[PDB]
Amino acid sequence: MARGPKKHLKRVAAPKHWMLDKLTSVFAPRPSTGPHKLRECLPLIIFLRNKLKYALTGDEVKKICMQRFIKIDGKVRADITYPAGFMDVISIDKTGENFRLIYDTKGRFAVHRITPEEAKYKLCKVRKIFVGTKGIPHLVTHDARTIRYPDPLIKMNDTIQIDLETGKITDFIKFDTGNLCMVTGGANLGRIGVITNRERHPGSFDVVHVKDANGNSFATRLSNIFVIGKGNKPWISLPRGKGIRLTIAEERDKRLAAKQSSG
Amino acid sequence: WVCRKTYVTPRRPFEKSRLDQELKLIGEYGLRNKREVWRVKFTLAKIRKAARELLTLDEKDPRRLFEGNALLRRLVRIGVLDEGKMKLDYILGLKIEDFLERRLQTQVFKLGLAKSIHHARVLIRQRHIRVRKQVVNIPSFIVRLDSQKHIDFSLRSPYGGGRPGRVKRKNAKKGQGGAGAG
RNA sequence: UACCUGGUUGAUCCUGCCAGUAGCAUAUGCUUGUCUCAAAGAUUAAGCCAUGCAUGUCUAAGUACGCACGGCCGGUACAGUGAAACUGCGAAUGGCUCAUUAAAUCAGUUAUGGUUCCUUUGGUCGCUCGCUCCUCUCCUACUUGGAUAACUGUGGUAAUUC
RNA sequence: GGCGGCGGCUUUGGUGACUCUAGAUAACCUCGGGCCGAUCGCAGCCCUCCGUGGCGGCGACGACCCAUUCGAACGUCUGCCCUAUCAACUUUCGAUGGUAGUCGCCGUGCCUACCAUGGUGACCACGGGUGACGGGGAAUCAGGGUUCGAUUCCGGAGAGGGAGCCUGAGAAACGGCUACCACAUCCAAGGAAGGCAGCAGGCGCGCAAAUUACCCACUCCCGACCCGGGGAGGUAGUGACGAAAAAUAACAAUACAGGACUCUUUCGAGGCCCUGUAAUUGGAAUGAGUCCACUUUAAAUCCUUUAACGAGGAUCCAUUGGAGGGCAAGUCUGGUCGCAGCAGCCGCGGUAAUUCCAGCUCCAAUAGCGUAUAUUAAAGUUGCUGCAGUUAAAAAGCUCGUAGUUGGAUCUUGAGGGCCCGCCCCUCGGCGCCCCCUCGAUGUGUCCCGCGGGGCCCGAAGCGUUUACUUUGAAAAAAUUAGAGUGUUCAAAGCAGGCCCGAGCCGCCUGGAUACCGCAGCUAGGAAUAAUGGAAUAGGACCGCGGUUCUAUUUUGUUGGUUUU
RNA sequence: CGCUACUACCGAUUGGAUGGUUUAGUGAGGCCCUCGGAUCGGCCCGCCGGGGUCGGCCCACGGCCCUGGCGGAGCGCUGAGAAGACGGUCGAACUUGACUAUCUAGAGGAAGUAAAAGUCGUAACAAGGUUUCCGUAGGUGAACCUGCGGAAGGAUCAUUA
């Protein structure tokens, strides 16, 4: 009777970009509520025992979260299924390994070891800039990190290098034309490159014509456009599969290569 | 979860010319029944139409190329098709028996310890051969090019080299109890 | 696999259905050696349901005055541990079933700038900006009041999670 | 400089858009009835200083008050099965609209006060019928099409039927309650205690459906929480649903019976491929088994691994269907004699039965095969593609005539290279213009020019009448399905996989492609095609302007006054 | 027309059964509101236990006050507040008839199909002994007959200066 919200979640009718299997396990990790909307989010337990595969059972991953070896956004995590969204660093506190959650142009999460220089700041394109009560301006980013006292020259869609040690925002990068933007969603997922064009409509439904690095020019809406810094200026490393765009006849030339070429 | 049939049924029940034509392929290649005829008959109708549809596609289509060059390669990695022709016109010209020769059974009859294709199905079924480090028990196995280069005696066939089971021992018991008088 | 086959009639050409003809998916007839997969109380009873069981849970961190257990280690409240119990949360979800509803569900697309939301993610917590200081006399800040469970026994109860 | 002249500085966050944020003043109140810790664990300090006041982390929990997450519920567009032997429907009960407020999480005839007579239908409304959960998707069909969606997914709906409350963020919860209505229990007669469409299981119904199983390990779930619990689920059982692989023995030797062959005039002989059949087997096997064992997993279980055993035969020994045709294979053999039966249909049987009934032989498929029913095709016997309507079914008695559905013609765009391009009959860019920081003469500012922003006006463009249409993209659950990587020992399939190093490589490494999106929409290219536009007793372009007049506000430092551009 | 089955029809029985409505009735049942005061504390004062002060610096016990106890007191006048209960609110529902639908009994009625070799006459087919048939209208046991207007689907595509 749907007498309250579902507190359960099973597999395959699950997001495919998490790269889960078929009905081999009849339940999903089911990420918690938090900073990002639930489909953007990625459970730790998929990244731990299904991507890095240091564990094999769930009660270990609970105890690994009781080991508290996991710092997402520089903040101590004991959640097996933490709602971590985009450009979220994951500090594996025992192996000394930082990994920032960014998407590929193939369509998969990138196990992507950024430098620890790049782990202190993550670039959050802002969600709102609001004059709160008693006349106080604010910035709140897409991970809902309510930050008082913004910058006095920023406007909408500016990217803040979010100090993951503190919050309490550091320097910004203004929303500018031609910025590097990892285009995410639809047929343009994981595509980085300059903007070069934006289209506006009163009301809703604005498209953004993006020409990426490979030369694929495409008009895909600003919801699909997450700015990651400045044009021809990345701020973390580029993910696997080049993070721009790949063709499938070339991808067989990719998939034939390092299998039986290593060790 | 998901299953399918690997054989096929024609819409004509008794077409005796076909029914004795199917008796040929069993007798020419060593098959179990008409299902082993109908198994490759189930495949080859799809193979020609997949060759037909890619032929009717516009050229320089990746769904024509990248699927098709796989389908070119998949038909050549098993060695049924040769890629010296390598176009959809000739893939419309393939047949059942090109696969039957690339089965494990006939290659045992072509190469190795098979005197008959009755005998050639037996050597797979009674596991006298290893096609790899692999006791392979399936006669409808259809092989690849490299697969025809490692078919040996099995190490569970105690004749031609192998650990004794109970049979060469029984054949020893034919001389050590069949001739040992107990 | 883009097919037909048989049947009108004295014979013939038609129309034309008949019946053969393959797919199927239950019911079933008969039969079945291995090894891999597996639908299965929907049809009929959204029938009644016997019984078995289907959401529990303590953190170094709510309250230890367990009659417990373990100790000298005890006093200011002291126990190591800790049933319970009170307190915190789920229990609504899950599973099951489709009877039902014919623009209704539902599906695709949209919007709440009409609406509410545990939880989580983040800010917000000195003050009455001093009653132009009760908040220095309002003297309770080193902290408040009473009031219950467990505990106990009296118990009553054909019977009761009384 | 107590000002009269004349000038000068001359100052607010977001939305496409809210009477948005923000501001302030006047307050308002919320009582048992908004708010800012009377808490709990871990642990380091400073003390004009000795036990306290100063104080710091760890995290416990809490709330102020919002972002969030989860969404919810309502509102938009597009989309559903059958019926006109359903044509008009809807409100006396608000039907529909407004206004006003009530109330509700809130929009709202939500609701009434009140007012209005609305609102809507042949495009089949209104109503009735449908096992109508719907859809993702499913089966089949060349295509066109046709059947399914209770069914491992999504969303909806109920837990016997309603009603009413409750809890909490979320429930009219039937693994709540309250009562009712239809059922079920104890009763000692007072009362008490109950709803498997949870897992099972049971009955019941039927043609038709398995454990009253095991485990919380795997999966997840809830917690105060690693801990636990879970019939969720996992696990096996049940289990020709159905699917996948494919056995029940080869193999020669022997011999014959020969076909080449060689000899031979042929005959015939030699001669194998042999395959049946012979007596056989000969080594040669194999699980079908049995079985130590390793394995397996919650424990298992099976699997695979197997020491070992398990085939010369009538074996370790396949079936289910058919022979009258259609329809393959008995003009068999016997019996039967229009009987018994058979035969989907066409048909046998009435005595020399190819239809029976059997034998035998053969055929067919095959661990299946056959039947029943169902539906898809075949079926162009529903004909959209693509039916037929003189005489086989099918032009109304005839005509007008609306819906209906169809409809006549007709307006303009050379070069580059061996096609390609733009052309012809203001918001951006931007040749210009002036302003401005000015660029090359010049380094609050000119005259190469807005190129920088522009502003205006161009080639260009809002252009001018627009769409249908087509095209571009976005968007377009997953599964599915198409299909890539992928040796599942083949395969059903999975999402895989592959290495070197001894095993210190303390590793290295491929991957898990791409296709699909009714519509409606969106997007932007096209503008043919189909509709579509204007100037008609004159209108459109040009600041042609004119005279009138309304008013909007910048500067006159400012304000005030009026006055104008 | 005889044998004779099937089938709907229709049907007395204002047959019965089941379901959906609907009038009105009753309204459970909780919700709102009106309450209610079963009752439980505070303040009170009487008295002492302590403290203080105003018998008292013996400011001390106690009077007194604070408070501790305690009860009375006005149970004042409060704080809480029960069952009940108010009227609505939704409304289970049932009743009452109406009402429909479904199912079925249903004597029987009346037929068709089937059903065949029972029976009349010879409809009509050859022009079928009166060529066929329509519409309609009567007739005729029945096949049918006739009239009125048709038609060719007749046996006529053909009668003239």
Side-chain angles (χ1 to χ4, degrees):
Chain A
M1 277 182 168
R3 293 193 301 278
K6 294 181 182 294
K7 294 181 183 291
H8 297 88
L9 183 63
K10 295 182 183 290
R11 204 171 277 181
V12 193
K16 187 67 181 294
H17 67 91
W18 292 351
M19 300 304 292
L20 289 174
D21 289 331
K22 297 183 179 67
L23 193 144
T24 61
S25 294
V26 292
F27 288 94
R30 188 187 57 78
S32 176
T33 53
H36 299 91
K37 292 189 72 173
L38 86 168
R39 191 176 180 180
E40 180 186 1
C41 303
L42 180 65
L44 176 66
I45 190 166
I46 294 173
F47 183 70
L48 179 60
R49 48 86 58 82
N50 298 319
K51 291 181 183 293
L52 294 177
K53 302 181 188 296
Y54 292 102
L56 287 177
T57 54
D59 191 75
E60 289 183 353
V61 181
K62 290 183 179 180
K63 291 177 183 290
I64 292 155
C65 286
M66 293 296 108
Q67 290 164 355
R68 291 182 181 179
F69 288 167
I70 295 96
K71 292 178 177 64
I72 302 168
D73 291 330
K75 299 175 184 179
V76 178
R77 298 291 181 265
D79 193 359
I80 63 170
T81 58
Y82 180 76
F86 184 71
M87 282 189 75
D88 294 332
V89 73
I90 298 171
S91 177
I92 305 299
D93 301 330
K94 183 70 180 296
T95 66
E97 294 295 326
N98 298 115
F99 293 101
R100 176 162 288 175
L101 295 174
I102 53 171
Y103 291 93
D104 293 327
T105 188
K106 287 182 179 289
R108 293 183 286 168
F109 284 94
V111 180
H112 182 70
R113 194 262 183 276
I114 63 172
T115 71
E117 298 293 328
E118 296 168 352
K120 296 182 184 293
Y121 66 97
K122 69 178 182 180
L123 276 83
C124 290
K125 184 180 71 63
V126 292
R127 190 177 68 191
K128 68 183 75 171
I129 292 171
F130 181 73
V131 181
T133 64
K134 307 286 102 175
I136 301 168
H138 301 286
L139 70 89
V140 183
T141 57
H142 61 86
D143 54 355
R145 295 187 176 179
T146 303
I147 300 302
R148 52 189 286 171
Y149 297 102
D151 299 332
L153 69 157
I154 59 171
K155 292 296 182 289
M156 298 299 171
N157 287 318
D158 295 333
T159 64
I160 311 292
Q161 294 180 358
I162 296 294
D163 195 2
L164 296 176
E165 299 173 354
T166 59
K168 297 297 180 181
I169 52 97
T170 56
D171 59 354
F172 71 100
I173 294 167
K174 191 76 177 178
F175 180 70
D176 299 329
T177 63
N179 285 328
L180 289 184
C181 301
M182 186 176 286
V183 183
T184 55
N188 305 114
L189 175 59
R191 304 192 181 184
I192 68 173
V194 296
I195 300 170
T196 317
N197 191 3
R198 289 192 292 269
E199 293 85 6
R200 301 295 94 195
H201 306 286
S204 298
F205 298 103
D206 296 335
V207 297
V208 172
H209 177 74
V210 173
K211 177 177 174 67
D212 62 357
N214 287 324
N216 203 167
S217 297
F218 53 90
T220 310
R221 296 174 184 173
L222 188 61
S223 65
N224 296 111
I225 309 302
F226 189 84
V227 186
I228 62 170
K230 191 59 67 184
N232 295 318
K233 178 61 177 65
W235 294 93
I236 57 172
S237 298
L238 274 72
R240 63 183 181 178
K242 296 178 183 178
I244 307 166
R245 185 68 269 167
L246 77 164
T247 63
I248 62 172
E250 186 184 2
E251 191 176 4
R252 183 172 288 165
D253 296 331
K254 296 180 182 179
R255 289 186 291 178
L256 63 87
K259 177 171 176 176
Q260 197 55 256
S261 296
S262 297
Chain B
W1 293 270
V2 58
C3 291
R4 73 186 291 168
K5 292 181 180 179
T6 54
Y7 60 91
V8 73
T9 302
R11 294 183 71 187
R12 287 180 175 89
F14 288 102
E15 195 178 0
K16 190 70 176 178
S17 65
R18 181 187 66 191
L19 296 175
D20 291 331
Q21 185 177 2
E22 291 178 350
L23 185 62
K24 296 182 183 294
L25 305 177
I26 298 161
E28 287 164 352
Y29 292 94
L31 297 177
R32 174 72 178 179
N33 51 352
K34 272 80 180 179
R35 187 179 300 168
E36 298 291 329
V37 175
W38 290 344
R39 183 179 177 181
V40 190
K41 182 181 177 290
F42 178 72
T43 62
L44 191 273
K46 186 177 180 180
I47 298 168
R48 295 176 291 111
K49 291 184 182 293
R52 190 180 300 167
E53 292 295 326
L54 296 175
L55 185 62
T56 58
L57 284 177
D58 184 75
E59 293 179 353
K60 268 65 187 299
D61 188 3
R63 193 68 178 173
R64 182 178 183 173
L65 289 175
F66 175 73
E67 174 184 357
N69 298 319
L71 186 61
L72 287 170
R73 188 185 68 190
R74 286 182 177 179
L75 288 173
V76 170
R77 286 189 288 171
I78 60 178
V80 172
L81 179 63
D82 295 333
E83 61 190 2
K85 300 183 289 184
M86 204 178 182
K87 67 172 176 285
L88 300 162
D89 293 331
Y90 297 106
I91 310 169
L92 290 172
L94 271 73
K95 64 182 180 180
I96 300 294
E97 294 181 353
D98 292 328
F99 300 97
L100 299 175
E101 293 172 353
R102 290 289 184 273
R103 288 178 65 250
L104 186 60
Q105 180 179 0
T106 61
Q107 300 298 320
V108 167
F109 178 70
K110 293 173 184 67
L111 300 175
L113 60 155
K115 189 73 179 296
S116 297
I117 40 174
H118 298 95
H119 199 196
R121 195 175 183 87
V122 163
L123 300 167
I124 307 163
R125 185 71 181 175
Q126 301 183 354
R127 68 186 59 80
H128 307 107
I129 60 170
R130 282 178 189 268
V131 185
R132 270 84 174 178
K133 192 179 175 291
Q134 283 188 354
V135 168
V136 175
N137 204 0
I138 303 100
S140 298
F141 175 69
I142 297 168
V143 311
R144 291 177 186 175
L145 293 171
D146 55 353
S147 304
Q148 296 174 357
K149 302 176 181 66
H150 303 285
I151 299 170
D152 299 330
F153 280 98
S154 68
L155 296 177
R156 295 292 296 163
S157 67
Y159 73 117
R163 181 176 67 187
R166 84 293 192 293
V167 187
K168 187 180 74 178
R169 301 176 64 88
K170 175 173 70 178
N171 292 120
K173 284 188 284 183
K174 288 182 180 179
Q176 296 174 357

